Amino acid sequence: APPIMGSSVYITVELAIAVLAILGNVLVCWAVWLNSNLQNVTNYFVVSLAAADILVGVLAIPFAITISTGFCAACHGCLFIACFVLVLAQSSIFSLLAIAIDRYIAIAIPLRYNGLVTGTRAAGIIAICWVLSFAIGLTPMLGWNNCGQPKEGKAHSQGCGEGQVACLFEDVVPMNYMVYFNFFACVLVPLLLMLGVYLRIFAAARRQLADLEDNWETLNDNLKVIEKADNAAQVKDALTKMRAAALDAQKKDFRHGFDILVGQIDDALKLANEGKVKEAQAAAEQLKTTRNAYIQKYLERARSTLQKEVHAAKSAAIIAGLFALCWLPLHIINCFTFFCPDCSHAPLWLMYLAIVLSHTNSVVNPFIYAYRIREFRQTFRKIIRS
Ligand SMILES: CC(C)CCC[C@@H](C)[C@H]1CC[C@H]2[C@@H]3CC=C4C[C@@H](O)CC[C@]4(C)[C@H]3CC[C@]12C
Ligand SMILES: CC(C)CCC[C@@H](C)[C@H]1CC[C@H]2[C@@H]3CC=C4C[C@@H](O)CC[C@]4(C)[C@H]3CC[C@]12C
Ligand SMILES: CC(C)CCC[C@@H](C)[C@H]1CC[C@H]2[C@@H]3CC=C4C[C@@H](O)CC[C@]4(C)[C@H]3CC[C@]12C
Ligand SMILES: CCn1c(=O)c2c(nc(/C=C/c3ccc(OC)c(OC)c3)n2C)n(CC)c1=O
Ligand SMILES: CCCCCCCC/C=C/CCCCCCCC(=O)O
Ligand SMILES: CCCCCCCC/C=C\CCCCCCCC(=O)O
Ligand code: NA
C-alpha cells in the first residue's frame, strides 16, 4: 500500500498527542505559577518535567514526523533531529530521580529538609541536569554516529545530493549507543535507582508508623502496670520507662502537652522513690487526662502527616512507573534489533506504535496530578472555569 496512507495515520496520531501534551503541561506550569500552595521544591522538578513534555509536543514530535519521511539531509543535521528527543527523555529521568530523592529526604530527615532542600539549590540542580541532558542526548553528535558510513545506495535512490543521507533514525544513530549507553546506562540504571529510593521511602514510612503505634501502646501498657503494681519499685520501673519514651517522642499545644506529660511523670516518680505507692499511682492516673487531651491529638496528626507522605510518594512513583511503561517497549525493540541480528526487524507498524506510546508519556502526568493531588485538581478547575 502507498506509504503515505500508513504515514498519514502515524502523523495524525502524533499531532493529536502533541496537542494534548502541550495543553496539559502548560496547565501544570500555569497552576504552579498561580498557586502559592504549589510553589515548593518538589514542584519545581514537576515544572521541569512539564517543560520537557511541552517540548516533546513542540519539537520532538515534529522532529519524529520529519525523520519518518527519510528526507534528504546533511547527516549531522539529521542526527540533531534524531537525538533531540533523547535530551528531553534524559531531562525527564533526572527530574523523576530528583522528585524521588526529595521525597526521601522529606520522610527520612524532615527536621533538616527545609534547610537542606531550598528553591535556589533546586533551580541550580535543574540547570545542571538540563546541561547534562544535552550532553548525554547529543553524544552521537560528538562522533558516536553512523555519518562516517552513509548508506549511499539509499541516498542515490532518493536523489539526495552530495554529502546527504536519507534521514532515518536507525541509519544515523548507532544501536550500540541506543542500547548500552542510552538504555542500560542512562535509563535503566536511573530507573532502578528510583525503584530503590521508593522502596526506602515506603519502608521508612512503614517503620515510622509502626513506631508511633508502639509508643502509644507502650504508654498505655505501662499505665496498666502502674495501676496493678503492688510496690513502689514496680511503679518506679514503669515510670522510668515512660519518661524515656516521652522525651523520645518530644524530639505549642503539643509542647505544652509533652511538658505536662513529663512533669506528671516526674511528680509520680518522686512519690514512687519515696515509697508512696498509692500516692504515686494516683499521680500516674493524672496522665490519662494529658494523654486524652494532648498526646492522642499529636499521634493522630503525626499519623495523618505520614499517611499524606505515603500518598504523595505513591503519586510520584506512579509517574515514574508510567514513564517506564511508555518507554520500555521502544527500548526493548532496540534490544531485539541490536542483540538478535538473526531475528527479522520489528515491523514498521510496531515501530510506529512504540514511538507513539513513548510520546503518550508526555500526555499522562497532568492527569495523574488531577486525579491524585487535590491542590492541583482544584487549581486546574479554577483555571478552566475562569
Ligand atoms: C528555538 C527553536 C524553536 C529552534 C528550532 C530550530 C530547528 C527546527 C532547526 C535547528 C537545526 C536545524 C537542522 C540543521 C541542519 C539540517 C540539515 C539540512 O540538510 C536539512 C535540515 C536540517 C535537518 C535542519 C532542520 C531544522 C533544524 C532542526
Ligand atoms: C510491560 C511492557 C514494558 C512489555 C512490552 C514488551 C514488548 C515490547 C515485546 C514483547 C514481545 C516482543 C516481540 C517478540 C518477537 C519479535 C520478533 C522479532 O523478529 C523482532 C522483535 C519482536 C517483534 C519483539 C518486539 C518486542 C516485543 C513486542
Ligand atoms: C524491565 C527491566 C528489568 C529491563 C528490561 C529487560 C530487558 C533489558 C530484557 C527483557 C527481555 C530481553 C530480550 C529477550 C530476548 C532476546 C532475544 C535474544 O536473541 C537476544 C537478547 C534479547 C533481545 C533480550 C535482550 C534483553 C531484554 C530486552
Ligand atoms: C527513543 C528514541 N527513538 C528510537 O529509539 C527510535 C525512533 N525511531 C526509531 C525507528 C524508526 C524506524 C525504523 C525502521 C523504519 O523503516 C524500516 C522506519 O521508517 C520510518 C522507522 N527508533 C529505533 N525514535 C523516533 C524518532 C525515537 O525517538
Ligand atoms: C557526557 C556526560 C559527562 C559529563 C561530565 C562533566 C562533569 C560535570 C560536572 C558536574 C557539575 C556538578 C556541580 C558543578 C557546579 C558547582 C556547584 C557550586 O558552585 O556550588
Ligand atoms: C502542535 C504540533 C505542531 C506541529 C507544527 C509543524 C507541523 C508539521 C510537522 C513537521 C513537518 C515535517 C515536514 C516533513 C519533512 C519534509 C518531507 C520531505 O521532504 O520528504
Ligand atoms: Na517526559
- Amino acid type, 379: T
Q: Is 383:34 a contact under the CB 8 Å cutoff?
A: yes
Name the method of structure determination.
X-ray
* Gap between the Cα atoms of 360 and 18, Å rounded: 9
Residue type, 196: G
Asked whether 219 and 239 are in contact (CB, 8 A), the reply is no
CA of 46 to the centre of ligand 7 (A): 10
Phi-psi region of 316 (alpha: psi -120 to 50; beta: other; left: phi over 0): alpha
Distance of CA 245 to the CA centre of its chain: 35
CA 317 to ligand 7 center in whole angstroms: 14
Nearest-CA residue for atom 16 of ligand 3? 336
Domain with CATH 1.20.1070.10 in the chain: 3-173+347-385
Residue type, 351: M
For residues 131 and 115, give the distance between their C-alpha atoms in angstroms, rounded to a whole number.
Answer: 26
Domain 3-173+347-385 bears CATH identifier 1.25.40.10: no
Residue 166, helix vs strand vs coil: strand
Grid cell of 381 as nine digits: 478547575
**Is the domain 208-301 a CATH 3.40.50.1000 member?**
no
Does the beta carbon of 325 sit less than 6 angstroms from any atom of ligand 5? Answer: no
Residue keyed to cell 550532553: 135
* Residue 271, CB-side half-sphere exposure with 13 Å CA sphere: 18
Q: What angle do CA 113, 126, 332 make, to 5 degrees?
A: 105
Take residue 199 and report the three cell numbers written for it.
522502596
Q: Which atom of ligand 2 lies at the shortest distance from residue 325's CA? A: 3
- Residue 126 cell numbers, joined: 535543574
Q: Whose CA is nearest to atom 18 of ligand 5?
A: 124
Ligand 5: centre distance to CA 132 (Å): 8
